[PDB]
Amino acid sequence: MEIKETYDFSSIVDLWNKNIGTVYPMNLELFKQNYINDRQRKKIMGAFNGEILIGFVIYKQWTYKSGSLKPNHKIGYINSIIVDINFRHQGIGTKLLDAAEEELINSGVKILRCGSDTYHFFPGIPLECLPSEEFFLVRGYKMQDYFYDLIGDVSKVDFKKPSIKDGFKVNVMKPEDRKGLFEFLEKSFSGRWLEEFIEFFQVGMKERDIVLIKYKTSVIGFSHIYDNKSSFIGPPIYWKALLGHNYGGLGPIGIDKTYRKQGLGRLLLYESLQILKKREVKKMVIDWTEKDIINFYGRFNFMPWKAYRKATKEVKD
């Protein structure tokens, strides 16, 4: 067996699907979108039996800015790691992760995270991969708390509009709104979300995927919505092969801090979901939510669907 770099995406995707595809179905379109577009220092290492790929690890160092956030070179990520099911418990996963970690560490990394990277596949260790928690624990990762993707079928329920105090307008974005959107982001959400807006417009997000809320003419919040015509495969629709025909998604969503807890986020979510409903969306997902926010969406009949554990390894000096 040899560990060496591989950019054979079909082989990686095939191995991904054979092992975990029941619950994380992968397609080449998504895999290449996410791997190729990522701007961090990144590598894929494979484990090989002759010509046969039997496992891989994908890993990154935070070397490229996030909005107004400087990159912190102290931080590295394990985007994913899979050993083929016919080759488990032979030390291959260990050797893969030792190779990744040793490189990151030589390049200045002191904090290693499971998923949560830019262009992630996972917010954390998936619940369907719960046995791997013990793998990471054995290597010095600490387990933390959970994030959730939520699922709902927007065609099955009707809701009544939160009562609209006047002045607040909710509408799909137009091109001329881009400046006002960016200025609102630098103000309120100027890290990863700002960066995602910049990058996602570069990889095929269109104005029709964005809903804006304004008080008068000031942009005071936004959501991003997905359906089967979106060009960019964003996190809400990663696992679209599980979601049937007329799938969709939503996230992120945000409201200017000085406008919070007045019912406006609820109005924004209400209007976003009506748009999707009118687009004939059925099953849809809200990705990467915290526990304490579930009920916000749960009022609209969303339920936790997938769970992920944050996990972090602090490198010893």
Ligand X SMILES: CC(=O)SCCNC(=O)CCNC(=O)[C@H](O)C(C)(C)COP(=O)(O)OP(=O)(O)OC[C@H]1O[C@@H](n2cnc3c(N)ncnc32)[C@H](O)[C@@H]1OP(=O)(O)O
Annotated binding site: 6-8, 81, 83, 89-91, 93-94, 129, 139, 193, 196, 253, 255, 261-263, 265-266, 287-288, 295
Per CB under 8 A, the list member of 9, 21, 71, 73 interacting with a copy of itself is 21
> In the bound complex, what is the minimum distance in angstroms from residue 41's beta carbon to ligand X?
18
> In the bound complex, what is the minimum distance in angstroms from residue 155's beta carbon to a copy of itself?
11
Distance, CA of 165 to CA of 159 (rounded, Å): 18
For residue 42, give Cα distances in angstroms to 15, 77, 125, 166, 288.
20, 9, 19, 49, 23
Q: Yes or no: say if 94 and 279 are a contact pair by the CB < 8 Å rule.
A: no
Using the Cα atoms of residue 120, residue 130, residue 238 and residue 148 in order, give the sign of their dihedral. negative
Q: Yes or no: say if 53 and 11 are a contact pair by the CB < 8 Å rule.
A: yes
From a copy of itself, ligand X, none, interface partner of 81 (C-beta below 5 to 8 A by class): ligand X
Residue among 75 and 237 whose Cβ is closer to a copy of itself:
237
Q: Binding to a copy of itself by residue 22, rule CB under 8 A?
A: yes
CA proximity to 80, closest of 149, 29, 24, 143: 24
Beta strands at 218-227 and 41-49: parallel, antiparallel or unpaired: unpaired
3-class state of residue 184 by DSSP: helix
| Side chain identity, residue 41 | R
From a copy of itself, ligand X, none, interface partner of 183 (C-beta below 5 to 8 A by class): none
Site string for a copy of itself, 277-316 (x = CB under 8 A): ------x-------x--xx--xx-x-xxx-x---------
User: Which residue numbers belong to the known binding site for acetyl-CoA?
Assistant: 81, 83, 89-91, 93-94, 129, 139, 253, 255, 261, 263, 265-266, 295
> In the bound complex, what is the minimum distance in angstroms from residue 131's beta carbon to a copy of itself?
6
Q: Which stretch binds a copy of itself (CB under 8 A): 4-12, 47-55, 75-83, 126-134?
A: 126-134
CA proximity to 92, closest of 55, 134, 129: 55
Q: Yes or no: say if 130 and 23 are a contact pair by the CB < 8 Å rule.
A: no
Site string for a copy of itself, 148-187 (x = CB under 8 A): x--xxx--xx-x----------------------------
